[PDB]
Amino acid sequence: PLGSDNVPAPKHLTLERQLNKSVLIGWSPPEPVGYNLIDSYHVYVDGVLKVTVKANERTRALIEGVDSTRPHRISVRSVTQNRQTSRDAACTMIIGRDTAHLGPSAVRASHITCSSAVISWLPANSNHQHVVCVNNVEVRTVKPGMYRHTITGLAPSTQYRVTVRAKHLRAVPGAYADFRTLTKGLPDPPQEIQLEAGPQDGTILVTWQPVNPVTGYAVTDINSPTGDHALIDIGKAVTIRTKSRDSQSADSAPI
């Protein structure tokens, strides 16, 4: 879609000159990995494709229509013959204003288990090393071009705040994410609980994200594992519980 982890990505993205409404950039080819070998490059500015450089050209580009007064994110993607690409976060940099001190953004936790999580981010400049911190503990320093890292050593059903920061580049600030680990022996409560008034007066519609040996849910009881809502008539700020084969999860976050 907008990139794949398999495809090796360009390195050493460089702003070589800045003009009033144009910029000249350079980069280096990706390391070969044996598969998904690179066929052409795609240059993006704030997500819009601007120039295509073929494999046997020089790895430089002059990008027109780039205003000097505004900040910008420039990124380069490797394109294979099957048209698979690398992700922007592997070869990206921000220019403009006084952006040299901006750090990573869009820090996200995914593939969460009871003891681990995959941490992703968008660097401000992918030539920098990045440091992953869990609850203010440095757990890993990650090489340039890397925008994902699995953290381990976590305890189940526990809250974690992870931050990512760029260590300064030697010539040749950061965001955070909150998440909770899964529960070891018992089901997990649903997330993304919301509530609103139903169609008719005196009814409310509570919704939640299905868990994805889950039986169903309880708020009055829903006995399908895929159910994502309940509508009750009050006449005839609460939590939901995931029910499973012999037990019910702890309660979710109230709304």
List residues in the chain that are followed by a break over 2.5 Å (C to N): 172, 212, 219, 236
Other CB atoms within a 10 A radius of the CB of residue 215 amount to: 18
Pairing of the two strands 176-180 and 159-167: antiparallel
Distance CA 121, CA 140 (A): 14
Q: What are phi and psi of 89, to 5 degrees?
A: -60, -15
Q: Obtained via which technique? A: X-ray
Looking at the DSSP bridge assignments, the partners of residue 249 are none
Contact call for residues 234 and 219 (beta carbons, < 8 A): no
Q: Pick from 57, 122, 128, 96: which is nearest to 43 by CA? A: 57
Q: What is the DSSP string of the chain?
A: ----SSS---EEEEEEEEETTEEEEEEEPPPP-SSS---EEEEEETTEEEEEEETTS-SEEEEES--SSS-EEEEEEEE-TT--B--GGGSEEEESTT-TT---EEEEEES--SS-EEEEEE-SBTTSEEEEEETTEEEEEE-TT--EEEE--PPTT-EEEEEEEEEPP------EEEEEPPPSSS----EEEEEEE-SSTTEEEEEEE----EEEEE--EE--TT--EEEEES------EEEESS-BPPP----
Contact call for residues 39 and 55 (beta carbons, < 8 A): yes
Domain ranges of the chain: 1-98, 99-183, 184-255
CA atoms within 13 A on the CB side of 109: 23
Distance CA 18, CA 124 (A): 18
Other CB atoms within a 10 A radius of the CB of residue 188 amount to: 20
Distance CA 128, CA 167 (A): 6
CA atoms within 13 A on the CB side of 132: 23
Location of structure tokens 């495809």: 7
Distance CA 248, CA 135 (A): 29
Q: Which amino acid does the sequence have at 119?
A: I
Other CB atoms within a 10 A radius of the CB of residue 54 amount to: 9
Per-residue tokens: 163: 């931050």
Looking at the DSSP bridge assignments, the partners of residue 118 are 110, 150
